Nucleic acid binder design. Structure first.
Lengths: 56, 37, 136, 100, 143, 78, 93
RNA sequence: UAACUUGGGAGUCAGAACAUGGGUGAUAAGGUCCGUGUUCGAAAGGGAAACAGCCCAGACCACCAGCUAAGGUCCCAAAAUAUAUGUUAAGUGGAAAAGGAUGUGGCGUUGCCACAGAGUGACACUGCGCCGAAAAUGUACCGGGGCUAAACAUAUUACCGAAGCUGUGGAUUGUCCUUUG
């Protein structure tokens, strides 16, 4: 409820390992946003796909 | 007049100069004249 | 002609050739040394050619120390052959020189004549060199 | 005297007694409509600002609700047996600006 | 729909004159190509030529930067085996001054049927006078 | 210009078959090896092929047997 | 001549060490008696000058933590390709 | 948001380039054989002048609406002849090495305070350039015109730019029956 993650870059040309991390956050389409509460588990996920998403 | 890509002085009298963007070596002895190095 | 008297396997994989040197980065035996700033293979025939051209300038002055040795052998297939049908045959012995390893060492001479001796030895090798001394 | 109104995602410059075609509207044929968002009023009148000027609404009467001419959407890939043909008729609404 | 297009009826072309005394070749030819094309006004209408007539006086005294008077060579062939001619830039300014300027401008226009009618609105003269005094060309400052 | 090499044998899948802290049955195989890389701890036997199997149920744990050696044990649940 | 030194806190990233070796400074560590491995910084050209005076086996009046400590140079790393040092150790006496 | 089990019907067994870890070859090949990713295959659209495999991005249909990505903003050709501060004279950019040299900047070392008066010698360490540099129809390794900044570094502000995304209508399937919707 305090973190909002939006998808900037596309998943084409990315390893399949990084495609499962975006699907585990709820980002289907490009420029889509979600609201999640911060925690050690959710913070390490956006740290894996840092170059594909931005956090406000 | 020698035309070699490695122009160097041979004795103490010779001198190295630059003419029209090219390394020249003019010396008192006409033997030690080199160009284009 | 430097070559080991015996080896376990005549045919070996070629060295890595990429990276940086492990040891031999300082001058321990002599006084004036010769560093390397480029990576390449030093054939044993290129060593005897540089050693003769170096010790000749110093008729009987001092001693020279060869710091490398051609342990690794390389192979080459005969002329006019297609690919496959096995491996080649030993043709020489090489070493691996990386930026920082001392190649030759000279002692027993002066500083002004050590530069001329190590200069004629550097034109025989396929790498770029730098005149170095012992560290403080 | 003209005005710039935003009606169907686009912007149109209107004039008194003019036939314009816009996107489909929920109003019936013969009734009236009123555009609330006006972006610019000029021409003969005094110049006004933006994004939306105070009041200055436009009223217009509905004329007809029909469909445009039919098109044929055909695409294909060569050497690959995959073709598809579609059809389309886009609906529209005609209005007449009676008062600016 | 709601966009204005200019046809043959509502087009007004003006005559301008440019002075080439103390200007660079390439820096001057680019701005003249804009006047000939018609991109200076709000009624562009790409499929119709709306440009203006322009006149360039003092075709001589065209300045070069660097060693361009000698190291710039103009090549041309003649559809004959081995036939190829070459003229340096410094020599072209001495013999045919207008050709040096007229070809640098025509190389910036599009090569079409309409891009050929626009290049015919240029008149370059080496002297300081122009014969077209019947019209009223107004001077123009390059920006 | 023929050669004399080119022959090899089939790979024998060795190594660990159960992880650490996993629940096993009373006849499961814990390790295939050639020799004794891991010694049989308590509640773990040793086969005729130096295979390590478990005798009872419970969690499997790898331990250390002195210096530069190790063993594997099985403890009952609860 | 005395080693005028400053301190650096936290964990210095890899980029800042490269930026430290370019501005003319050298990292060092004092791990003597009671100093508790205090990480310290020092100038490059002022270190070569002082060791020429006293010698390789001489004491140094180093100022760390805004106080004087008598330390010597135990060992240092040297990059032979760029004829300059990269690290200094200080064993307090 | 998928996995496993049972049954019905299949196709495939000639793969390619690119990045990377390695054998073989000659630290040759758009070579050949393996490991790990991506795209093509079966993928339209924008960029690289043209160019299945490279960079950006996955087309349900319609619109004379808006915002961005990679790449770009003197003219061809949509958008800065934008701002501050330096470097480079070769048309370098917009083809090549060992080696040679008073080309020109930046930061240092150090002995005579003369060399022929305020300047003067010798090295270390780096930025950008010069020589080495010769092929066959026609300029011909900038896409063209042309350019000493419209070149290269560095630090900030605008804008252009795709079938990506948003805006406004419409056709289907599926799923919640918050609204026979």
């Amino acid at each position: 409820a305090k973190l909002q993650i939006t998808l900037t870059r596309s998943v084409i040309g990315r390893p399949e390992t990084q495609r499962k991390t975006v699907e585990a956050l709820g980002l289907k389409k490009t420029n889509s946003s979600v609201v999640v509460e911060d925690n050690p588990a959710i913070r390490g996920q956006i740290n894996k796909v840092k170059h594909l998403v931005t956090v406000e | 007049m020698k035309v070699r890509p490695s122009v160097k002085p041979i004795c103490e009298k010779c001198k190295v100069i630059k003419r029209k963007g090219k390394v020249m070596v003019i010396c008192e002895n006409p033997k030690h004249k080199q160009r284009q190095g | 002609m430097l070559l080991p008297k015996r080896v376990k396997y005549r045919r070996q994989h070629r060295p890595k050739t990429t990276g940086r040197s492990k040891g031999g980065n300082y001058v321990t035996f002599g006084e004036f040394g010769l560093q390397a700033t480029t990576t390449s293979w030093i054939t044993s025939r290129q060593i005897e050619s540089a050693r003769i051209a170096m010790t000749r300038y110093m008729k009987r002055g001092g001693k020279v120390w060869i710091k490398i040795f051609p342990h690794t052998p390389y192979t080459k297939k005969p002329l006019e052959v297609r690919m496959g049908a096995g491996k080649g045959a030993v043709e020489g012995w090489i070493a691996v020189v990386k930026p920082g390893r001392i190649l030759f060492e000279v002692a027993g001479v002066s500083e002004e004549v050590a530069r001329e001796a190590l200069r004629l030895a550097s034109h025989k090798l396929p790498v770029k060199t730098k005149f170095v001394k012992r560290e403080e | 005297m003209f005005a710039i109104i935003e009606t169907g995602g686009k912007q149109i410059k209107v004039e008194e007694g003019q036939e314009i075609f816009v996107e489909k509207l929920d109003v019936n044929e013969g009734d009236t409509f009123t555009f609330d968002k006006v972006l610019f009023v000029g021409g003969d009148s005094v110049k006004v600002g933006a994004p939306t000027v105070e009041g200055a609404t436009v009223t217009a009467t509905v004329n007809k609700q029909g469909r445009g001419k039919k098109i044929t959407v055909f695409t294909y890939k060569r050497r690959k047996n995959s073709k598809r043909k579609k059809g389309h008729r886009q609906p529209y609404t005609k209005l007449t600006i009676d008062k600016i | 729909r709601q966009t204005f297009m200019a046809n043959e009826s509502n087009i007004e072309r003006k005559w301008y004159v440019i002075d080439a005394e103390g200007q660079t070749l390439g820096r001057l030819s680019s701005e003249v190509a804009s006047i000939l094309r018609g991109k200076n006004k709000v009624t562009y209408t790409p499929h119709v030529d709306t440009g203006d007539y322009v006149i360039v006086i003092n075709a001589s005294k065209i300045e070069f930067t660097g060693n361009k008077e000698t190291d710039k060579v103009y090549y041309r062939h003649s559809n004959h085996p081995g036939g190829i001619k070459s003229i340096t830039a410094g020599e072209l300014r001495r013999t045919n001054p207008e050709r040096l300027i007229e070809n640098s401008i025509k190389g910036m226009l599009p090569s079409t049927r309409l891009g050929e009618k626009q290049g015919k609105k240029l008149f370059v003269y080496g002297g300081a006078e122009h014969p077209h005094a019947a019209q009223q060309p107004e001077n123009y400052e390059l920006r | 210009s023929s050669t004399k090499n080119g022959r090899d044998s089939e790979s024998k899948r060795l190594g660990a078959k159960r992880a650490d802290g996993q629940f096993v049955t009373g006849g499961s195989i814990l390790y295939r090896q050639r020799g004794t890389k891991i010694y049989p701890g308590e509640n773990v036997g040793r086969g005729g092929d130096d295979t390590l199997f478990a005798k009872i149920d419970g969690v499997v744990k790898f331990e250390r047997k002195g210096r530069d050696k190790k063993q594997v044990s099985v403890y009952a649940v609860a | 001549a005395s080693l005028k030194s400053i301190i650096r806190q936290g964990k210095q990233t890899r980029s800042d060490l490269k930026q430290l070796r370019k501005s003319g400074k050298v990292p060092a560590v004092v791990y003597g008696y009671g100093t508790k491995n205090v990480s310290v910084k020092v100038d490059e050209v002022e270190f070569i000058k002082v060791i020429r005076e006293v010698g390789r086996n001489g004491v140094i009046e180093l100022g760390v933590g805004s106080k004087t400590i008598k330390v010597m140079v135990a060992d240092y790393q040297f990059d032979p390709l760029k004829n300059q040092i990269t690290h200094i150790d200080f064993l307090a006496i």
